[PDB]
Ligand binder design. Sequence first.
Ligand SMILES: [Ca+2]
Ligand SMILES: [Ca+2]
Lengths: 300, 302
Amino acid sequence: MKKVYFNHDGGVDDLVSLFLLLQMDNVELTGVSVIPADCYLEPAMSASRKIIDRFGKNTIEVAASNSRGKNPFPKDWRMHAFYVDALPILNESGKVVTHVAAKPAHHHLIETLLQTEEKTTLLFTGPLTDLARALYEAPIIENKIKRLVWMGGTFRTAGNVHEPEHDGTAEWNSFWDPEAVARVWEANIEIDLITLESTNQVPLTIDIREQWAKERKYIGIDFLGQCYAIVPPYLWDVLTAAFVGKADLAKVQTINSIVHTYGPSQGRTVETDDGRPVHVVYDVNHDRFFDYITRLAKKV
Amino acid sequence: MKKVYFNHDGGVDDLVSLFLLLQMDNVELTGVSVIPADCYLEPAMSASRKIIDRFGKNTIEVAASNSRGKNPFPKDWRMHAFYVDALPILNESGKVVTHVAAKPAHHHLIETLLQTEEKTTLLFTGPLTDLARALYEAPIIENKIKRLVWMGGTFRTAGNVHEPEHDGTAEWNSFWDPEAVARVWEANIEIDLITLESTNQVPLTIDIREQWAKERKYIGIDFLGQCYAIVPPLYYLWDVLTAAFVGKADLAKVQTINSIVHTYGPSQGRTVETDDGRPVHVVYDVNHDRFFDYITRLAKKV
Ligand SMILES: [Ca+2]
Ligand SMILES: [Ca+2]
């Protein structure tokens, strides 16, 4: 049983991952928080609360970030939570029961970590700024962090950031706040990294969307399919979440690394023999991965 | 029983309209066709075919337009069909049975109208260019048109078109092809207009979305809700109201006004009331409760 604190930024994948983490027997979410990076805050807060009401177990709260980004995501990607938050499945109950936490995400994270006895695993599928902030303000939290699992970075020649001022070598979660990645990388914590590359072997395919639609009878599968209709014809965050729940889906190669913090290469992650250790996921088992998440969806 | 030929441009409310027409006991769809105006053609074609498969009755075909627009819709509005087409409810069967018609939409329209013995009601919820074109090639078709019900136009000082080269006075279905509107306007046909204003009394509201979500148990209500999630609160059901007026004329009133359309320059697509113009029957004073009760009744029939 792993105690997990989950900070996400409200894309379809972040929200799908919330849904799946809640079906893992092996995981207990101590807290959820939302950062307005790849989302607008209000729909992502709401959708998270409704998913926990609908598909959750214990009583938990969702905290809102008041972090601000250096390099904001494209407005069009950010809209997706409005759609998820509007799905009938998530509105059928006509009530939102799970509470917004009183404290902002970074303070919520601090308070949750320090109030849990056991060390907790941090799962971040958006930028790292709520964590950089928690560290800056209360670095004793190092002692409560088992490890950080983060969707971010790439060690290919080019990333997924194609934006003015940028050289095109960074990945989005890092580019959104390179200074936060730097701070996290100075902290004394173990870091498992799901990079852009890490997901090579599990592309979300039309044959996989169509197999899901065939099993729409399962309400969790129907829900998965409504979520991915919004981004129609890689599951970065889902893979990250799934690696927390089932480490054996993939392998990990320890590399030494730095993050660039300014100029046209800001956000870029670079392997250096001088840098700090980072355990980079590779070699995802296709069949096991997709069998795992459809198993989990069917538990509802 | 009304014979209806339906031309739509594959926005969310076009596709929702198709689904609801199909539940109306007093309507028999003789033909459906898709124009790539507020949609990309492929997802709109597929979505229409899958809707007819899952929720339709008799065997019909969907024709693809090869009409082109003068003033294209914004890209981001046009994507919405991709999402509806990808919804699991519509992909559960794993096959698409209803056929694409062999002819393009304007030709399809002509052949359908002339092959059906009684007159047919034309229902257009996108631009008018498949009809303009039908009329240009085969004006005999006036003889088979009971009337046109069209979502288009506005008689307010401003419309919903906010685009370069335009003065902001037109509505989108007219603006997409103003020449087509002019051609239809010159035809000897009766025209019922659902304008932008027509819908004032029936905003889609959060309270209505939520009340639909509560009855998700009905698969057609759940389907309606999925469709409207795509266009969520951050809205007026213009096309759905147009389609409902065909099924239940008694939901609204109509005022006959004489009208022209501007065809060129910064005011292109503008509809203007003139004592000299041609008669158009403009919908107003929609009964809120009956309208929304009607479409929720229709959704529950599946
Ligand atoms: Ca994310
Ligand atoms: Ca339309």
